[PDB]
Amino acid sequence: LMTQIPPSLSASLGDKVTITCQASQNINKYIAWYQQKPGKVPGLLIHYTSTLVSGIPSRFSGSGSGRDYSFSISNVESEDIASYYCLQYDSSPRTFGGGTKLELKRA
Amino acid sequence: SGAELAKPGSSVKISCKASGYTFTNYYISWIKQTTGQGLEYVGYISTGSGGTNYNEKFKGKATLTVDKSSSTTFMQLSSLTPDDSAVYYCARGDWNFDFWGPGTMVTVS
């Protein structure tokens, strides 16, 4: 299964952010990261831990070992608001993390 | 499609029309998102061999299936509970679901 922390993530434009997940068995780098922009279906960002699926800008990167995996956004831009979800594919059935809502800190 | 309002215990068959791709090169999987935004895995079918798997949550009530010929994925929900209320997606599955469903809201009340 999966645990995602933190739940909310206030961040300023330009800032970096990190969202992590932890599994119950070692999942061998088979985890993926989804962005569900508000009012839309989720979309893929990274699969196999760190492999960026095409179209995703390189400000997103993934990493992780054993049971902990992290998504990092180096320079947060406006379009990156919404809820992120990790998901493992180490063993069926595929299980998703509870989600981390990224909100843009503004004036 | 196939969604809508249904009274607890009712049944419903969700569809999912795929295009662009070679249908049988990829597994389709049913994932839902509840009103409180939580995502859940509903089921997994391998369309070429017929094989279906599920969490306990819907075990014995939902039945995933497909038609490699007509390019259709199906979800047949039976004995619906209030907790099945949610948006239902499918998604073409190689190592992930990289596309592709726009949703379809089922509401059990």
> Residue B21 maps to which CATH number?
2.60.40.10
Could you tell me if B107 and B6 are in contact, meaning their C-beta atoms sit under 8 angstroms apart?
A: yes
Tell which residue, A42, A69, A47, A10, has the closest CA to residue B41. A42
Distance CA A96, CA B8 (A): 26
DSSP state string for A18-75: EEEEEESS--TT-EEEEEE-TTS--EEEEETTTEEPTT--TTEEEEEETTEEEEEESS
**Closest Cα in chain B to A85:** B39
Which resolution in angstroms does this entry have?
A: 18.0
Domain A2-105 belongs to what topology? Immunoglobulin-like (2.60.40)
Contacts of A47 in chain B (CB under 8 A): 95-96
Q: How was this structure determined?
A: cryo-EM
User: Could you tell me if B37 lies within 8 Å of chain A, comparing CB atoms?
Assistant: yes
Provide the domain count of chain B: 1
DSSP β-ladder status, A8-12 and A100-105 = parallel
Is B102 contained in some domain?
A: no
- The sign of the CA dihedral A21, A26, A29, A30 is negative
Interchain CB contact of B40 with A (< 8 Å): yes
**Within an 8 Å CB–CB cutoff, is residue A95 touching chain B?**
yes
In chain A the first and final C-alpha atoms are separated, in Å, by: 38
Residue B30, chain A, CB below 8 Å: the answer is no
**In A, which residues are within 8 Å of B103 by CB distance?**
41
Q: Does A16 touch chain B (CB under 8 A)?
A: no
Query: Nearest C-alpha of chain A: how many angstroms from B88?
Result: 10
Helix/strand/coil for B37: coil
Tell me A78's DSSP state. Answer: G
